[PDB]
């Protein structure tokens, strides 16, 4: 399973490259400000189930007829599966942040999620409308720009990694586009 420490060793074994210290400086930049990844992960995994609390509630306020007859989150069984559907994919977003690659959301989640959501008739527009809501919901704990809450940080620019979650949120709508 890939991470950014081992992204280069599946790159350099095309070259059979004994890694002299030129290409390793990005890994020495990965170990430089990986604390800002680490200080964002504790700002995610402690504030995790309030991301999904307004995900489908933010979806149903503008796409109202999925709790209507002929919806998709009509019953209690139809709705509670959707709240675990969104919380699984945000669990699998933040595996990739501390790892450093786009491994885990492709080799487990999107190795077959496009045929999943069309086997059930899960609407792909509303299952990216919530994740576009969960895009900007997941950047605000990294940014500390939130209307409601402040996390005890140190003050720098994490905008290299504030859009890296959005650079994981783009390829979750790769197949379910």
């Amino acid at each position: 399973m890939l991470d950014a420490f081992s992204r280069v060793v599946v790159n350099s074994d095309a070259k059979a490259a004994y890694v002299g210290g030129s290409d390793l400086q990005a890994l020495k930049s990965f170990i430089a400000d990986g604390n800002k990844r680490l200080d964002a992960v504790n700002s995610i995994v402690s504030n995790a189930s309030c991301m999904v609390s307004d995900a489908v509630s933010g979806m149903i306020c503008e796409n109202p007829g999925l709790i209507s007859p002929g919806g998709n989150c009509y019953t209690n069984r139809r709705m509670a599966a959707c709240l675990r559907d969104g919380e699984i994919i945000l669990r699998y977003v933040s595996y990739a942040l501390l790892a450093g690659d786009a491994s885990v959301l492709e080799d487990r989640c999107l190795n077959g999620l496009k045929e999943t959501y069309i086997a059930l008739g899960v609407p792909t527009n509303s299952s990216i409308r919530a994740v576009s809501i969960m895009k900007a919901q997941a950047v605000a704990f990294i940014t500390n720009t939130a209307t409601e809450r402040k996390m005890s940080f140190a003050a720098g620019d994490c905008t290299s990694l504030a859009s890296e979650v959005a650079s994981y949120f783009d390829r979750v709508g790769a197949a379910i586009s």
Binding site: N63, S68, P69, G71, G121, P123
Partner: protein, 172 residues
Amino acid sequence: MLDAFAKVVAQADARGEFLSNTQIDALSKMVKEGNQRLDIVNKVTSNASAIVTNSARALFAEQPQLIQPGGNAYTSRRMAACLRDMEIVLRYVSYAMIAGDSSVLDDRCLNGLRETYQALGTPGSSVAVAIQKMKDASVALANDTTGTPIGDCSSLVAELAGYFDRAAVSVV
């Protein structure tokens, strides 16, 4: 493409015998109810779009995420292609109504239609609602007694409801 008459002929030839006396009057029953069956498809071809636009406006008022911006059937190139599928299955059930069987219906429409709806990403539970939205409107005019002499046409509209039910199953 078989008929009701050709289905009982093709079972006889694979057994290798003539038609029995119980099978000719089973078909002589079927020809004296022919003007009932000609009066049914005259009702659902003289209203062959007033069924469809009133079934579309029923469904679109009920399910609102079809017409939403971003929807499956939102734009006007995916709106006539929604009304194309609502109009050919009213056509192809009415071919299966006049035949007496539905082997015209599944092979010319429904063979793998839920597999092409899988490839487009189409919600198929709502189109099965739209066939059921078309099914009761089709039997409300088949039961309409205007202009025709009055008799019993009971099992023919239960045959017509079975053709819509076979269409609405294999599209989800």
